[PDB]
Design an enzyme around this catalytic site. Sequence first.
Site, PDB file in Angstrom:
ATOM      1  N   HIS B  41       0.737  -1.052  -0.031  1.00  0.00           N
ATOM      2  CA  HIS B  41      -0.005  -0.014  -0.121  1.00  0.00           C
ATOM      3  C   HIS B  41       0.662   0.702   0.238  1.00  0.00           C
ATOM      4  CE1 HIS B  41       0.022  -0.393   4.468  1.00  0.00           C
ATOM      5  NE2 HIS B  41       0.615   1.044   4.111  1.00  0.00           N
ATOM      6  N   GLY B 143       2.487   6.666   9.405  1.00  0.00           N
ATOM      7  CA  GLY B 143       4.217   6.427   8.766  1.00  0.00           C
ATOM      8  C   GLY B 143       3.842   4.934   9.976  1.00  0.00           C
ATOM      9  N   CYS B 145       3.593   2.028   9.504  1.00  0.00           N
ATOM     10  CA  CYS B 145       3.277   1.023   8.551  1.00  0.00           C
ATOM     11  C   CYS B 145       5.031   0.130   7.643  1.00  0.00           C
ATOM     12  CB  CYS B 145       2.305   0.968   7.249  1.00  0.00           C
ATOM     13  SG  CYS B 145       1.029   1.779   7.744  1.00  0.00           S
TER      14      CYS B 145
HETATM   15  C1  LIG Z   1      -4.107   7.249  10.544  1.00  0.00           C
HETATM   16  C2  LIG Z   1      -3.018   6.078  11.000  1.00  0.00           C
HETATM   17  O1  LIG Z   1      -3.031   6.441  12.036  1.00  0.00           O
HETATM   18  N1  LIG Z   1      -3.028   5.173  10.515  1.00  0.00           N
HETATM   19  C3  LIG Z   1      -2.430   4.191  11.059  1.00  0.00           C
HETATM   20  C4  LIG Z   1      -2.283   4.000  12.155  1.00  0.00           C
HETATM   21  C5  LIG Z   1      -1.576   2.959  12.988  1.00  0.00           C
HETATM   22  N2  LIG Z   1      -1.233   1.903  11.793  1.00  0.00           N
HETATM   23  C6  LIG Z   1      -1.560   1.797  10.513  1.00  0.00           C
HETATM   24  C7  LIG Z   1      -2.205   3.137  10.337  1.00  0.00           C
HETATM   25  N3  LIG Z   1      -2.564   2.952   9.168  1.00  0.00           N
HETATM   26  C8  LIG Z   1      -3.790   2.215   8.475  1.00  0.00           C
HETATM   27  O2  LIG Z   1      -4.391   1.939   8.548  1.00  0.00           O
HETATM   28  C9  LIG Z   1      -3.575   2.898   7.327  1.00  0.00           C
HETATM   29  C10 LIG Z   1      -5.134   3.451   6.525  1.00  0.00           C
HETATM   30  C11 LIG Z   1      -5.569   1.634   5.072  1.00  0.00           C
HETATM   31  C12 LIG Z   1      -6.798   1.024   5.233  1.00  0.00           C
HETATM   32  C13 LIG Z   1      -5.959  -0.324   4.672  1.00  0.00           C
HETATM   33  C14 LIG Z   1      -4.231  -0.577   5.037  1.00  0.00           C
HETATM   34  F1  LIG Z   1      -3.858  -1.607   4.244  1.00  0.00           F
HETATM   35  C15 LIG Z   1      -3.408   0.248   5.487  1.00  0.00           C
HETATM   36  C16 LIG Z   1      -4.629   1.420   5.787  1.00  0.00           C
END
Ligand SMILES: CC(=O)Nc1ccncc1NC(=O)[C@@H]1Cc2ccc(F)cc21
Lengths: 304, 304
Positions: B41, B143, B145
Amino acid sequence: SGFRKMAFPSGKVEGCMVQVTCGTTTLNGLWLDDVVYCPRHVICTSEDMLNPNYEDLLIRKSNHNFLVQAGNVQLRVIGHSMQNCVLKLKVDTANPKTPKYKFVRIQPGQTFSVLACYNGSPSGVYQCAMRPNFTIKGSFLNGSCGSVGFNIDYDCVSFCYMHHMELPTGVHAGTDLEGNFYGPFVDRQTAQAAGTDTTITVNVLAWLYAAVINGDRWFLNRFTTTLNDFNLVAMKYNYEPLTQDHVDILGPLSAQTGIAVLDMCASLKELLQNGMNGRTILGSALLEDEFTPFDVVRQCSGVT
Amino acid sequence: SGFRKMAFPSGKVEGCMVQVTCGTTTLNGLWLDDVVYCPRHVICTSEDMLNPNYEDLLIRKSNHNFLVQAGNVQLRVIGHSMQNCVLKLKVDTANPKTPKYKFVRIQPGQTFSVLACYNGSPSGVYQCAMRPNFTIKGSFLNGSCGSVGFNIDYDCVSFCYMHHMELPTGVHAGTDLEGNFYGPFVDRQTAQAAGTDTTITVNVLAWLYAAVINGDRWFLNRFTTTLNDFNLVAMKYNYEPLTQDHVDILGPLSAQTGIAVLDMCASLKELLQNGMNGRTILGSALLEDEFTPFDVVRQCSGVT
Ligand SMILES: CC(=O)Nc1ccncc1NC(=O)[C@@H]1Cc2ccc(F)cc21
Ligand SMILES: CC(=O)Nc1ccncc1NC(=O)[C@@H]1Cc2ccc(F)cc21
């Protein structure tokens, strides 16, 4: 989102751990530049620990009696000295892995990461707090002495603790990196008891702010209180008295959530007076006090 | 003595973290040999996340669109491929810090350390468990991920998790290092809910054994039970059914304490039926299930 008892990445500290052997005793040392720091009780046998005269015991020891090993390579000891409860072994090689470092003596209530080691090898990393009674609730076994506590500021490692002793009560005692014990503890196998362990009120509040930021809001009530009214309840529950400095420190967390410090105090007061009623806050059934307001801001903002 | 939620030393994994940028998205990558692994992603914008066609999106991307940075030095990308939900970026330089490593897919109930990172820089380390519903209760922000989960066996790092997503419910989802999600989760911004989260009974028992070894014995009663009688109570409290394999795995902890597994089950049964009555076990007011029998034996024996 999510809130965890997080430790600093330990890599910079792992590169500093060495094994120090003197006679039959093996413990951990911290190698920074050309100096290896370790607990002075490395020179003792279990018989000496009853009433050790460290000056007299050290007099029977020469540079060649201190065996220092970093991995599988032996360090050459060219000097030895006792500074309070730590021995400083001067080696002929500066640690090539020495990070930017400081020696700092922490205040009760402040937190730090411990890299638990055995035979100079790291086994694990966990987050601790220096309790108001100057003990730490760690996880240490025989061989763990010399394991260190630290904090990291971008690239600077601030060493704040060296593990020395386990009290008969299962709690832990140690020194700063100048060899001064936190609290009234002495490196002697004698009856030493930890005083009353109070709860770090400011840390509990910071953790309540972390719970609010991370979704847990059930404990928020329609009440408020004053510093004096809150402290009357804090004394009864062996909580540290909240000061205006504590309220000030909580400022950024109050600004972020939009909940005034004294309002959060009223929620805490009701939690103390009534308990959790079988509910949890941040996956815990008790009030957590080992996150400083700095730890909460750090974790919730992603400081690397 | 002492029992703490301990993570593995993170040094070997810190040396593998890189920053991967594609367009406006920046996340973490894992650099092992000449390959950088990251969530696929990375190629998406928040608009694409609603219904992304990763094959079509990847077709519009070339080697030069993936910016990989290890510290302040740029890595040259000479290949890119998608393996399930991970991208593998072939770089022209092998990571000089690559430890001995394996890619392993863990079973629900097993634990691992997470090195939370932002912009390729580590911020913290904590211990997690793969929940029976295949989620993890981590601490991750935007950030984070690409942050990884791992275990260490002396010098071999077993990578078992890469962080991908936070579910609307605040829990975390991710993949193994082959890009396969743990559980039914998909890397799409859609309504995905974690199923029922059951308690890892074998881990709770191992933690009760850790409590006994470390002094907490108040919960030990004069009773026993059977696997079938215990499981009738475990079902009612959404606990994983205890199997004979679980009893076998608890063998060394039963041998060390001299308390038969079924006797410990009877203590657990009474704790489930009556609660803690305001008491704590290992400083916790709830039954801890994120320590495997291996973690307890490891912590209580000092495996480095
Ligand atoms: C905004 C924030 O703190 N986000 C996170 C926090 C903690 N871990 C990850 C994220 N990121 C996501 O979850 C993004 C949004 C979405 C949908 C599907 C997907 F595969 C990955 C993602
Ligand atoms: C046997 C075991 O596991 N011990 C430990 C466990 C955890 N932490 C430390 C120790 N070691 C000690 O507490 C030794 C005994 C004594 C007396 C004074 C002193 F300064 C240091 C020590």
